[PDB]
């Protein structure tokens, strides 16, 4: 048969980075797509997983194996062993600020590769329990991407889909 690659790429709304949605993809598969950097397999002709998230424009560099940053370490981590990204400025950027997308700024330990964390627990930095009250040494784990269409080229939102082939 053919592959529903058209239902992840051309999807209505992608999920936020921290809650990166994964879709399992029997078919053989042959836009601007700014970065079509591929690491896992050489570009030449059992299952594959499609991970779709929304990250800041410049953060596309962080979605690579052996890369160290907030996105990779905390939000979405890739194992050391293709990636497609397009700019969604006119699609996912509200003038008053599209705070719908969130990223994980505070985490005790780095994320395991392909691990997924949807926790909303207050980062307990100090030795006093935060009991659901944000204050000193008690900071919310997630921050909101300020997404305005008038943002710079870097800060414009870029829809990204990750393909992870599994034989």
């Amino acid at each position, epitope marked *: 048969n053919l592959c529903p690659f058209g239902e992840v790429f051309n999807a209505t709304r992608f999920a936020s980075v921290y809650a990166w949605n994964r879709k399992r993809i029997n078919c053989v598969a042959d836009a601007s797509f700014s970065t079509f950097k591929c690491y896992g397999v050489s570009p030449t002709k059992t299952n594959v997983y499609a991970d779709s998230f929304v990250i800041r424009g410049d953060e596309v560099r962080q979605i690579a194996p052996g890369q160290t940053g907030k996105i990779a370490d905390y939000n979405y981590k890739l194992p050391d062993d293709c990636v497609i990204a397009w700019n969604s400025n006119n699609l996912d950027s509200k003038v008053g600020g599209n705070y719908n997308y969130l990223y994980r700024l*505070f985490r005790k330990s780095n994320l395991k590769p392909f691990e997924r964390d949807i926790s909303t627990e207050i980062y307990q*930095a*100090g*030795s*006093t329990p935060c009991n659901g009250v944000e*204050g*000193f*040494n008690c900071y919310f784990p997630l921050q909101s991407y300020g997404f305005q269409p008038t943002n710079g080229v870097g800060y414009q939102p870029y829809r990204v889909v990750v393909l992870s082939f599994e034989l």
Partner: antibody
Amino acid sequence: MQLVQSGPEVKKPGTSVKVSCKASGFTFSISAVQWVRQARGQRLEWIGWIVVGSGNTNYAQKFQERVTITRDMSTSTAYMELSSLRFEDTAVYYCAAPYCGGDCSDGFDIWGQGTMVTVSS
Amino acid sequence: EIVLTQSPGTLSLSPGERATLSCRASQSVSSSYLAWYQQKPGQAPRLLIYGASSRATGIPDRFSGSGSGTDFTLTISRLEPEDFAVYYCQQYGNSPWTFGQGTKVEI
């Protein structure tokens, strides 16, 4: 481990002064910088505090318009700028942060030397 | 707003005498967020007690902190020559964070 504040500052009324507090020795990421001002032989006054990691800022209503507290993780330096300087704003300004090496120590244990901003026509 | 009232204004005692300084608040403050600071003449403050009762690292054993709710007290059992300074009490629980007028330790 220490916090090193900026050198003494001499500014005119109506300008804006920026005092730099640079963190060294402790993991500045999960820390939080608090700015306190003290005039000669007078009680301490608290401007505001910033979560270094999140960047979220909370200001006392006194300096709401007049100050902006920022930080730069590349230089491990926190900044506090007081705008529309008045003669009465002349005082030493202190920078306080918690030694948050592993666990954040639950207390402002690091205080800077202070910066002396003198405002006069 | 939290009001931090310190008593007394000027406290004068001889070395080897117990110093009982008190810090009072308007509305109860979280006991985990009540610090005491020591201010030397022309020096940056150094935190004595954090958490209203836990002593800081590198602080002599003579300094001890107590109190909960609206009342907090700092106790110095063995006053020393270097122990003469002003003592400020700050709360970092509820916004805005406030500082006391400070109590002076004299001879």
